[PDB]
Symmetry: D2
Subunit: 343 residues, 4 copies
């Protein structure tokens, strides 16, 4: 029966925020690398994993010149970062906002093993999520991030994996919208394996269909949501080669038959793709002749920081050289999400 | 796992047929009134329900002048009719085809009561449907019709009704596509009751979501399908009044959050709407500012024949006057499905 | 909500019939071999597949001396047989009944291929099943048979196969109970393959769980039903050997964690098991130390007729020798379903 | 596919623990009243809600004379209590154990509102539950408690409520079994409302069916689990009166058609029933002529402490009088779970 989960005013707030993030030419910078995640980053460039270093590396990205402004409609931060400040004592959420970006916050607590499965998982973080979202909202966050991981293999993703992960994404999304936070559903399908393009498109189609059915069961406002899916590509170990147009067609197709037009936008994850690779693919996708009723932009992390982190190396004197690489990719991906990339 | 239900060639055939039916400005004429259905029609105009009369009334519609050609992309026939001929010994499927229309055939066998429910039902017709489709395909049919009925009330549509009806529509759709027949999924939600616009949009959204999840589970090719849903409107007995723009917004909205863009088209059912009423609403719908990734056309029966049948009255001398009323509505609805309706 | 599918009087009738069939020491004789099924039988013994021969072979079994009376609580017949008569012009349903047996009728119309699957199927026969059941009930039938086939392989039974087959079994069961016919749910899992005991128990557990969840969704009266499942055994081509106690434990276990105690009884199918083999296994099952809240009897066909058909060979003079083999197995299985078999 | 969630040794440990708790004549004492729960208790008897008072009241129950030993097979504690000690510095888990009881621990974190529903909820507590269970196991706990609340009303329990609550109970159960903790599934259906016995039995049957289907999907070992359901009774505000035999029949029936015989036992919750009332009903239930393949015992809180708490009143001098009332109810319920009660 009709028992509204959201009021017209609440729907407007969520829809407004969602559109802002994926506005034309705009994308998302994923700087939510968790503890163990960012640790490896700083490691690859002989840099002590200290809170100060993390605060510096983050400030480095969030303070890049204004050339990045029209390219970044949103940036995801980890809990720690959301409460750090720039050298001028300015809170990071303020830095981002001052540059026209929307502040996002990762609210999930990592994946957990699914018993009785073949190395499959689901993710936690629902406990006290409501009050957490109410706080984050007060502290400048307007959208959240929650990653679910699925993988292609012999008997995976299993029916349990798909069903459980889809249900948890809906619970998370539900709680988010209750606190004025735009939830970004992220049902990532690992690119690991030797499977081909077809297998990926198939699993993506099945997974995405289950995801939105769950979202419907939990009464979630699609307009006030975003989707962070994997692009459709062959396994990393696949022997067969495919073109950028082929993965672009497979991607848009898989999305066309599963993602309702009501969904405000799609912010792809680079999932192990090189900076250039992820940009070209995003461009191809936006070039696909088919009809796309939702924004097809980016939500990259490594594909946006790889070069930067490298140019940084931990040396403070390398601040400019590092930021230049980032602004470079941001500009590159701002065009791609418009189908104008031209390297 | 990847076990193709359709080949690329099979998908092309189905997609091609689907697009033909809903090509710009084109709609569908529902002349599949069954035995007891068409019986009441002929009754309302003091006319014996004889096979010859039915053959005449049908010929009357299928032979209207060429003004109807660009307006009719498809017409659904009942079994009997599919094997009848025009006065010139020309098979009806040939008449339709010669005018550029695609021939459709109703394959369901009516609704059956769902035990343990409050007057709810599901529909049968799956037995030997495959061989039936193979035959119909050979005899000129390219798409099929199967109607499922749902109704809004205290505890209806129940979870069983929605789940069962959605599953049967998928089985039907699956068998159709296996025989080169484009299945038109028709999950009609009766307009009966005193419920309002909101209640209808809610039930439509929930029902449509279940429908496409089932279609996905049964591996059906969305591009090779059409959707024949009810427009979103208040109950027939609703006290509150709504405008054509209001039902147009409620309709497009309900569709935007449930119907994947891959679906080639949506052919609305008039469901008790007057000829004019159904035309204006279809126009409003196509006028809705929102983004519509699928064709929003018509699949009317009464809203296309009401006046004709009346002008006919059984008198053969009234052939011209009758056909004129039909051509009138066909032209009226061809514009509407383009958002250009006049008064 | 509470909308009774059955009245107390209707539930009593169904429960009563169900208990009668599986009363202590009683089992079921499956003589519902269809057209192509019984054809091979008569073939193996150089006998023309004529209606008269079928009528004779059937009469041969249904007229065996009274020693079989306490052993047979029910016998399933094919449509044809249900309307045939014994040499004395006595209708077969009357013969069976006069011997204290309940008459059953197969109402399904065979399996159909499931598109998009690896050789998987579902079964049809729901069309006009209601009126069919009303007739059969009038003509002496009190319970029905409907076989669904599932098979173990790489990716089978698939989620579609399990879900579809479980739903159809529920629709069938629902219609049956509406017409005073006790439905026997038969979710057979082919023993084909080289899988082991564990794999079978696993699939059986998963399949059986889905079956009863569907039965619940369709509001079916468990007490007024029976279950005709496959025993838990290794694939026919399995390399590993198992004892009668091992398959008995695997069987009872798989049933204990899926079959609600409300289910009046379980009538196992022999599924390619030799006459002796099926008897010993049924005995072991009834000997299992675990707690069994339902009757664990038989519903054999070949395991009950193999020897008979052979001793017959088509020769009318062999009537006695043939019936003796049948009575032999019936007596053998009457003990087994009591755990008193005496090899 | 076959990917064992539990080893034979793990299954044995869980099954063993489960049987111990519900051994003949034994029941469970629910002393897991949370913070706000036990607060009201101490309030009703003018007693400051201090940790010392709670420690005393708990010690009071866990140290009752040995007459309670054969009556208590298990007792559930709240986190705090699990780490408190008796006056002799003996850890509570040790007190319980020394008396032959199994120690249980509530691991859920309360109910949370389900958005888009009519006051419906689900419960949280899955985050870090694994490590929590590993710790509790080390600290003497062998089984856990997790309460899900459902309620009967106009459109409740809704499909979302039933589906979500059933899935969370399965996740909880899954994690528990991975850490050698026997999970007790508690899908409580509030007795609030003016509904009758029939409505309750219906909802209980539907809810219980969904619960076990979920448990199956998550591959949980039924033998290593217990069920804490509500007895089937009319709403608290129901106008119609029923006998103890009537609710006993409705209860056993609802359980017979939903709870697999593999489930080791059922520990009913008193849910607002008076001490006497809960005892008589438990007796009637065990007196029901129907077949019960699982233990039908108790898991009471108020129905076991009501009189005690009252006789205590906070006064230390009232220790004996208080414990006597508890031992009284424990003895009363030990008989009831055996069908030998006799007021
Ligand atoms: O003819 C129709 C044309 O539109 P569709 O809904 O078929 O598309 C509709 O108007 C329905 O048939 C109408 O409800 C007839 O119901 P009836 O009066 O016979 O009891
Ligand atoms: O007759 C039977 C008796 O037991 P039920 O399984 O019917 O209970 C079974 O033995 C099956 O019909 C058998 O697999 C026949 O298959 P077929 O050789 O014709 O290809």
């Amino acid at each position: 029966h009709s028992h509204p989960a959201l009021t017209p005013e609440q729907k407007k707030e969520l829809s407004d925020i969602a559109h802002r993030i994926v506005a034309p030419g705009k994308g998302i910078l994923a700087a939510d690398e968790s503890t163990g995640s960012i640790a490896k980053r700083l490691q690859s460039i002989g840099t002590e994993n200290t809170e100060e270093n993390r605060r510096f590396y983050r400030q480095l990205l969030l303070t890049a010149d204004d050339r990045v402004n029209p390219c970044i409609g949103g940036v995801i931060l980890f809990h720690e970062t959301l409460y750090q400040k720039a050298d001028d004592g300015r809170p990071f959420p303020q830095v981002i906002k001052s540059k026209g970006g929307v502040v996002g916050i990762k609210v999930d607590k990592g994946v957990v093993p699914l018993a009785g499965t073949n190395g499959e998982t689901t993710t936690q973080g629902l406990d006290g999520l409501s009050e957490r979202c109410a706080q984050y909202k007060k502290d400048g966050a307007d959208f959240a991030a929650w990653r679910c991981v699925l993988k292609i293999g012999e008997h995976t993703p299993s029916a349990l994996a798909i069903m459980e992960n889809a249900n948890v994404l809906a619970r998370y999304a539900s709680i988010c919208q209750q606190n004025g936070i735009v939830p970004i559903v992220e049902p990532e399908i690992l690119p690991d394996g030797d499977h081909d393009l077809k297998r990926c498109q198939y699993v993506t189609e099945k997974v995405l269909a289950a995801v939105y059915k769950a979202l419907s069961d939990h009464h979630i406002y699609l307009e006030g949501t975003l989707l962070k899916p994997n692009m459709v590509t062959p396994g990393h170990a696949c022997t067969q080669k495919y073109s950028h147009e082929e993965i672009a067609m497979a991607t848009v197709t898989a999305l066309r038959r599963t993602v309702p037009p009501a969904v405000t936008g799609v912010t792809f994850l680079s999932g192990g793709q090189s900076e250039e690779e992820a940009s070209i693919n995003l461009n191809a996708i936006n070039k696909c002749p088919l009809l796309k009723p939702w924004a097809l932009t980016f939500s990259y992390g490594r594909a946006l920081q790889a070069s930067a982190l490298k140019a940084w190396g931990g040396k403070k004197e390398n601040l400019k050289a590092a930021q230049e690489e980032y602004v470079k990719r941001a500009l590159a991906n701002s065009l791609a999400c418009q189908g104008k990339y031209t390297p």
